[PDB]
């Protein structure tokens, strides 16, 4: 169950990086630290907190058309 969230955080940081988010050093530092801290977690309840904090970065900007990719 924690391996699930670790691989998901890998995919999330890769998407964020593809969206040119490392053009702003503050944001990229925040996301990088959240990612490396998720990968080193050792109890699945902190990982989900930092995952919601990390996904908020993608939900912020409007570059990914969310209503389309949510066709379920």
């Amino acid at each position: 169950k924690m391996s699930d969230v670790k691989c998901t955080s890998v995919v999330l940081l890769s998407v964020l990086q593809q969206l040119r988010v490392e053009s702003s050093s503050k944001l990229w530092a925040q996301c990088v630290q959240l990612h490396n801290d998720i990968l080193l977690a050792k109890d699945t309840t902190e990982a989900f907190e930092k995952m919601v904090s990390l996904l908020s970065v993608l939900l912020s900007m409007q570059g990914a058309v969310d209503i389309n990719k949510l066709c379920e």
Binding site: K1, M2, S3, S25, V32, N36, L39
Partner: peptide, 19 residues
């Protein structure tokens, strides 16, 4: 594989770094 409480689990990853 990767069921909770097993002997072998994932500890080698690709860590990212900033500026």
């Amino acid at each position: 594989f990767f069921k909770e409480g097993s002997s072998v689990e994932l500890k080698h990853f690709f860590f990212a770094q900033d500026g």
